Amino acid sequence: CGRTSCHLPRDVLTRACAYQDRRGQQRLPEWRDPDKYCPSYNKSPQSNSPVLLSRLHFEKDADSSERIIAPMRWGLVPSWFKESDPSKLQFNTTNCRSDTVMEKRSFKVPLGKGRRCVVLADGFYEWQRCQGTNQRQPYFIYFPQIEKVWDNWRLLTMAGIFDCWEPPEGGDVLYSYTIITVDSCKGLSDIHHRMPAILDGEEAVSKWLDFGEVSTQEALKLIHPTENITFHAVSSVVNNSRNNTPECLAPVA
Numbered sequence: 001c002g003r004t005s006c007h008l009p010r011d012v013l014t015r016a017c018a019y020q021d022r023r024g025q026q027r028l029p030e031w032r033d034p035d036k037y038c039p040s041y042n043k044s045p046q047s048n049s050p051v052l053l054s055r056l057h058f059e060k061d062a063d064s065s066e067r068i069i070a071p072m073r074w075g076l077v078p079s080w081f082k083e084s085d086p087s088k089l090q091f092n093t094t095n096c097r098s099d100t101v102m103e104k105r106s107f108k109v110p111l112g113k114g115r116r117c118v119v120l121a122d123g124f125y126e127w128q129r130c131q132g133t134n135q136r137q138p139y140f141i142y143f144p145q146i147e148k149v150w151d152n153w154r155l156l157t158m159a160g161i162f163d164c165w166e167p168p169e170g171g172d173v174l175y176s177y178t179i180i181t182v183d184s185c186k187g188l189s190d191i192h193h194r195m196p197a198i199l200d201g202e203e204a205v206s207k208w209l210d211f212g213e214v215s216t217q218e219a220l221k222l223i224h225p226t227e228n229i230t231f232h233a234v235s236s237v238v239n240n241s242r243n244n245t246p247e248c249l250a251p252v253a
Helices: 010-015 105-112 202-209 216-220
Strands: 004-006 040-043 048-054 067-074 095-097 116-121 123-129 136-142 156-165 174-183 194-196 230-233
Touching (some): 048 156, 048 202, 105 156, 116 202, 123 156, 156 194, 156 202, 202 216
Parallel strands (some): 067 174, 095 174
Antiparallel strands (some): 004 123, 048 067, 048 116, 116 156, 136 230, 156 174
């Protein structure tokens, strides 16, 4: 999936990420790089989106079940990239197939470092290929839910991999990510043949995040098609990646 919505303001987003650590203590995730968060209904590759990652990535003695929320660049910039600017990458690496993550250097290495994140979104967009034409129908795809809807929205929690890159001649460390993909479930199969790897609930999210306690092999068992998802058709407003408006995700007939 190549487009998402993530529009909620920082404190609403944070509240939506309330969790318990391993010992059952109620917490809210702490932000890092919070100025990089720019809410939008229409996020494309190369923009920043908030992700969850284990606090053990930031402190050597942190409880690895504690969670940080940090905006990261969508489009993985591998640690070994040698040019001066991420724009000079030939491919964005916005998605990666679950069946290639242990085969490709760009994913396998960060996984070895425990660089597992949970990519947040209101939902994602996908375009349905229809038989006997070139026009594609956009859909907004999201978890089943409980103006009023944004009070207590359940954010979509997608499995991602992140990496850290430093400009070779000198500059700040860049955190960037890719979303893992899997086959679509029967519910989405008329829309598209692929879907994100969705981590459905606290257990799945915690295990994917906690690289301290959950090995790569164990973590990857969490990666599979899932059924707990819904969707509705949206207008052509979203088609233009420059349109950031509530209309992007509004239902149409």
